[PDB]
Amino acid sequence: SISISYSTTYSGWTVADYLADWSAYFGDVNHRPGQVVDGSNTGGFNPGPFDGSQYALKSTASDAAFIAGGDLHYTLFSNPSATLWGKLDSIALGDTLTGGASSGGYALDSQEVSFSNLGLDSPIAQGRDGTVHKVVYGLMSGDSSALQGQIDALLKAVDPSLSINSTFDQLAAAGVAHATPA
Ligand code: HEM
């Protein structure tokens, strides 16, 4: 089942409000044709260069950052082009990204919320329609809708009363979340 970690700061927030707000603040890095700039809005893989157990990206304007964890692959120019696919187990949100391939991984100096045991697996053949691609490219674009839809499905699978409209505290009471010190 999905497992959610949250700073006590967010105990009374709904997941949806937290995500809508975090993503709006992270803001669109404009990773689109004509605007991709290596080292500015590409993010990076560990160990990389285009595959690894983590993909991480910091905002081009705020300190906000996220880390996707699992077994991830980016096709670059190979068919189907510009596709992130593979197994996505976790998404961590916060600010102040640190690390990288030369450190052995990425971390957030301030990790606010993480969603683990996501169990998302997208085959390469689905290309940019795959869930993994939609979730992460949505985040890169300042749009947590795809992530929200996957979290909602995972929460309903535990119990239909649970959803992104539950508070983190409600989800902790339901057995799927736990707090970390603020
Ligand atoms: C090491 C990380 C990455 C590098 C170096 C990279 C590089 C590129 C390059 C060179 C382009 C062509 C457009 C341009 O140059 O302006 C591009 C486009 C694109 N990339 Fe990335 N990318 C990375 C990560 C990702 C990730 C993780 C995703 C999805 C989750 C993604 C999704 C896309 C999409 C959707 C396009 C536009 C495709 C289109 O509409 O033609 N990229 N990327």
Side-chain angles (χ1 to χ4, degrees):
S1 299
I2 188 174
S3 178
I4 302 180
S5 187
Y6 63 96
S7 171
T8 60
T9 302
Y10 303 109
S11 302
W13 287 54
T14 70
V15 180
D17 282 347
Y18 175 83
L19 290 175
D21 292 358
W22 181 87
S23 280
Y25 196 83
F26 176 89
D28 189 349
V29 308
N30 302 325
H31 188 106
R32 285 191 291 278
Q35 289 186 70
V36 175
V37 178
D38 199 49
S40 164
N41 64 352
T42 53
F45 287 91
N46 180 50
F50 303 110
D51 304 86
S53 52
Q54 297 176 307
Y55 171 76
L57 174 64
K58 64 185 181 183
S59 172
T60 42
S62 73
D63 53 6
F66 71 88
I67 305 168
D71 177 19
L72 297 170
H73 302 286
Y74 183 63
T75 62
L76 192 66
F77 311 133
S78 304
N79 182 61
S81 68
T83 292
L84 180 75
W85 65 281
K87 299 180 186 307
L88 180 63
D89 296 325
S90 63
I91 293 288
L93 306 176
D95 63 65
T96 313
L97 187 65
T98 60
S102 68
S103 299
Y106 291 107
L108 298 164
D109 274 348
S110 174
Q111 180 175 296
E112 291 173 354
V113 174
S114 71
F115 307 90
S116 303
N117 297 338
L118 295 174
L120 299 169
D121 297 341
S122 293
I124 194 176
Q126 286 179 21
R128 302 182 202 146
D129 276 14
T131 169
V132 169
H133 182 91
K134 291 285 195 68
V135 165
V136 176
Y137 191 62
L139 295 172
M140 297 170 69
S141 301
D143 187 345
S144 63
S145 295
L147 176 59
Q148 287 180 43
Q150 297 304 309
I151 294 165
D152 220 13
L154 284 158
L155 288 172
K156 175 170 176 291
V158 175
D159 191 275
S161 65
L162 303 180
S163 77
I164 56 180
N165 301 313
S166 301
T167 65
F168 289 99
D169 271 2
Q170 284 173 326
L171 295 178
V176 302
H178 61 273
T180 57

